[PDB]
Predict the 3D structure of the following.
Amino acid sequence: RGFTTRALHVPSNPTVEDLEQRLKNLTGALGVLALGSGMAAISTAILTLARAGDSVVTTDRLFGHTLSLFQKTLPSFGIEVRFVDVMDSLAVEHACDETTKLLFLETISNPQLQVADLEALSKVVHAKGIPLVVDTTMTPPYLLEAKRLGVDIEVLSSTKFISGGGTSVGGVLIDHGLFEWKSLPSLAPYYAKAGPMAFLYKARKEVFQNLGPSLSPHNAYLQSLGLETMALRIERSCQNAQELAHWLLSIPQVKCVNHPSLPDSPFYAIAKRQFRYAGSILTFELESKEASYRFMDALKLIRRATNIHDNKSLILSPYHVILKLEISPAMMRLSVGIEEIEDLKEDILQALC
Amino acid sequence: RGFTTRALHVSNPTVEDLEQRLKNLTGALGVLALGSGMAAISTAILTLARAGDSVVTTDRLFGHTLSLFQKTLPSFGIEVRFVDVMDSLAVEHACDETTKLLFLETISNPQLQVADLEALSKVVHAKGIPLVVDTTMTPPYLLEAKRLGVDIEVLSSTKFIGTSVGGVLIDHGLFEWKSLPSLAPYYAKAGPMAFLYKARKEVFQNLGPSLSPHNAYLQSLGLETMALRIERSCQNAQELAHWLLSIPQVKCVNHPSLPDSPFYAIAKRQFRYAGSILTFELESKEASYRFMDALKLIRRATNIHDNKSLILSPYISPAMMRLSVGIEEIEDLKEDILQAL
Amino acid sequence: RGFTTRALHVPSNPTVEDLEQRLKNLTGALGVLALGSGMAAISTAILTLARAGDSVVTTDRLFGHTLSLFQKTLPSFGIEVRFVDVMDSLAVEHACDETTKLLFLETISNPQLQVADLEALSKVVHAKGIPLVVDTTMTPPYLLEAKRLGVDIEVLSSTKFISGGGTSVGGVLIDHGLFEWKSLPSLAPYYAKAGPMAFLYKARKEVFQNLGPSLSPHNAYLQSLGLETMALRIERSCQNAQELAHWLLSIPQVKCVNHPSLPDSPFYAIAKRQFRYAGSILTFELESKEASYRFMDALKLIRRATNIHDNKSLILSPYHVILKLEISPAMMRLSVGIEEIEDLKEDILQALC
Amino acid sequence: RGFTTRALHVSNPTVEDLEQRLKNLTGALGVLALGSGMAAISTAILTLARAGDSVVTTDRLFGHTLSLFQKTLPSFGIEVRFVDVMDSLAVEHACDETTKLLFLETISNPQLQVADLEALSKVVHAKGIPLVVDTTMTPPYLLEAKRLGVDIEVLSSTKFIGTSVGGVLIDHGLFEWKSLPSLAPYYAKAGPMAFLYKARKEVFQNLGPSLSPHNAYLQSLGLETMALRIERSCQNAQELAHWLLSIPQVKCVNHPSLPDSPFYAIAKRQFRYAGSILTFELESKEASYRFMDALKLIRRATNIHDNKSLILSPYISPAMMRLSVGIEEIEDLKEDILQAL
């Protein structure tokens, strides 16, 4: 059964529930919780497993809100945070001990597009009886079947919808039905009540209920509507990014094109094993910081902005926004949209001259 | 300036507009709109309390707010002390140097107990502890919380029926936040705005209970008619509580506006009206069930503070019903109750 | 049973239907049709009764869109329009002949606040077997029970809702169950199919369906929500206007205060007979056009604008906007809102000095 | 520039934005968004025709569009002449000096008859009569109507399920409007914009089929994925019509993309794809009913052009079903049809 047909034909709060049922139908999951934002999904998954006196392990590649959750909020709830290089399975193994209640990471880092080996990391952590929680925003369900790679809990930010009145956001939390929850002292009391639903039960009836990141039915409705054309939009988006990365290799003025679909990518093999397509974000450089700025000022379709995964193609210089130390001032990050490929190539050519 | 006037004449422009309206209505230092009532309560608490601290609250909580204090906060290493908030001495003895706030509601549910806010603010302020109050039962038109010493006001916003929910966090500009180790580090960056700065840029941003612009628009629309709806609703509830005293099959009417109510004086000092919820009993559980089955306007349901009048049996006496009084003309409410007897 | 309780407890397109049922419950009508706008209600009522070769009679007090419908659109469908002074029952009687399929007017004219005698005019037209169609926007159902005054068809513009994205509008068409439709050759074929529902049947299944002024369920939902607080808002609004008109009489700088609730009003008796309150619009003058402008520039709550029946109090000089010949350049029209009366008095005092 | 690019990169700002998108997608002189498809058709007609005029349209209308031409327009003193639009001679003989437009659809329903637009535009232009076409079956991504001589394009917008509806009126910048007595008086004020000026400031303003900003926002969102959804939908329908030819229990498949279709050549000349609706029969009415009862994905319903695939029996053969093909993966559509046989 295809993705688009599963978004369309699913086998109190009826709009939110209907969204949750779609998402479950789309992933084959044990169950799903829709929440008010991506940060709310992340923090709900963590706070379901971790409490004062525990630790958690995560990537040292976080910034902005996700970073601040781990640097400021979690230590205020008595949770020790261990930052590690998630590219290194041995550093991950050594950071984990009996206080460690989960490993959290992202499917593709931003802006470097590093791709951790999820299955390998799932095994390192499963051997110690620790669950794996992954933010799959860069590679949502049509691109990734996280259950096959050992991912216990999948979290993501939902399709955003921008209006005059502000941006409508959401989050999604997915239990893949992999981890034996009853083996954790955190969830054993909920196993008595809910059986295999122990994680989802605490997450929903306790953590979500008490911290209250409610999802509006109006947002839920828009997100369901988005799920209908997700496969179609992602196919377009991701084929455009794959073709752009390849074509960028032919442009004299362009250097250091980075996308995991390219054969010279360090993450070429792992991406091909994990993903239908390695997401719709790529990176590249011109000769200098100043050539990159002049290029960007000259684009007529692709716009400068902060968001990613818009229908519109968007670009920015991650350096100008502030480890920064490891990124080139001449690097630009391109979030590729659903425009016809010929127009995007044409805009980029034109902005070069 | 009147309340209605101030609701009407004052990134995320709809949410910000809602926040400015609420700040105008309240005269507050500042205001944060959030995805729900629970988000507002938990955001206020987690701005002040962290692992190794304690908090004091009323022993009259149930449902979600109770589960936050029984399960979620002790998991964050926060010790919760439950006390009888009717007793200012027990409140005093529960607070020590670890205690980072007192939390309570303005009118308890379903008993309608009214704590003496100004008396409790003094007990807690005398130890350098802020007062955080859920004013859902008595929102801004009914209560000026800052006059009673309330540092942080929290409430559930007007719901719109899925159901669109919200919450509101209000800093009344009372507590000197730089004197607190929890906020002194923000004081450099935000001055008097240090509570709001932490709450918005750290706790809210990281736990993510985002308020939808669509909910925010509706709640703004709602604020315009708030004074008008609360007047009607609260005069109806006052009148009905009185009138109920005259009905031979009715016993034990409870509302703080009744002279014989234990909370008569405290409610009169604190509130324009003591909320739109009242309680009463018939002869017995069975007479109460028959009465409710026979109602044609007032409907049985769980929600409170709807435009529609709603009733339920909380079982506290098994014969007790709780009536959330709505904005229907008083004559039809009286008539439906009579007919159902 | 009170108005507010009838808006709350009503005894395909479920949101639109629910609105229609509320409105019927609020008016005691035979039936109701909700439409995309006020102009759509007006034109639907007219085009249900009138066709090429017929005439219609209406007030000579129309302007803007309503006027343009009668001056340009209706004559293009072969309908003769006869404009008359509706203050004059004898001019009305003489304008009507066997080709005349309805009399259309408004409950209170704008900006002059003239109040035609509806019951008298209903009798003039009923005697000739002609129905009466009335726009009751100035005096909607809580203020007026149009059936008691002989009004066959009540039409109105719905409560508007302004957002970033533009204004959401609607219209309402009400059959009061008064006229015997089967006596008209226009509606007799529909009487065969629908009985007493003949008017509503043609209006809905034909005129509305074929010209297509559809009402959005999103607008319908907002309008239903508005109906809940209509009585409360109108009571406030209308008491404010009544008290303002009275109080304005005490202000040295103020002249020619016009509102039908004032005893010296020419429409004092007819308004008291017809309305709970004579609407929330009043008019007054200062000494000169220039004193009026300086007053208006100095108001701090009451704002200059074109709309009326907002929650906010709004004012304008009808002269500056362009018969104009019969209106004073120093006259201002005040649409009174729901602000506390003390603030409105205070703003007006302040803007005078 | 591609279609998707143009949907994305272009008082009442949401409606105006929708209109600018549609103008970008079409290269038109201008565009009016309206409250429905019927509002768009009636607005185009009533801009051109008045009492004492005639109009010509196809004899293949039913439901609302048919009732407008049978009941509403003759009541406005407009004579309506119904003709076989497949026959350019009958079209010519129906037009005289009173005739102010020819109206038809791009693909008739349920027969799927495809009129030769460019041939009919010539017949009608040779008499100074504009061509007004409802392109609902073949919207802008599928058809560039201006190339085929179509003066005014009208269509129902993408619906969102109550149900939010819309319509669109498009002036392709082809007809010289000053040569017409109906519009010459606007030409002074509006120049080339005289059709649009009358339609918007007079007919639309006075009959009031206002488009909600909320519907308008959704339809804008919809336009962004229009090319993608129509590709999928129309390739599915092409493929299914072919594949249906191979199924022993299927007879009489109808789709203009089939070589044996009478409209094969005309559809290929006019359309990227000939719409997403096809027709077929089983052995008998009863076999057709059993088949439809047994479908698990494709649902019986009245709507067309949904994301979901929909089917019904229009009874034209009683055994005929009409399938509105949606955007499901082709394998699952094939599989549901097989399983149901």
Observations:
- The first helix of chain A runs from residue 3 to 8.
- Residues 232-353 of chain A form a domain with the Aspartate Aminotransferase, domain 1 fold (CATH 3.90.1150.10).
- The CA atoms of residues 190 and 198 of chain A lie 5 Å apart.
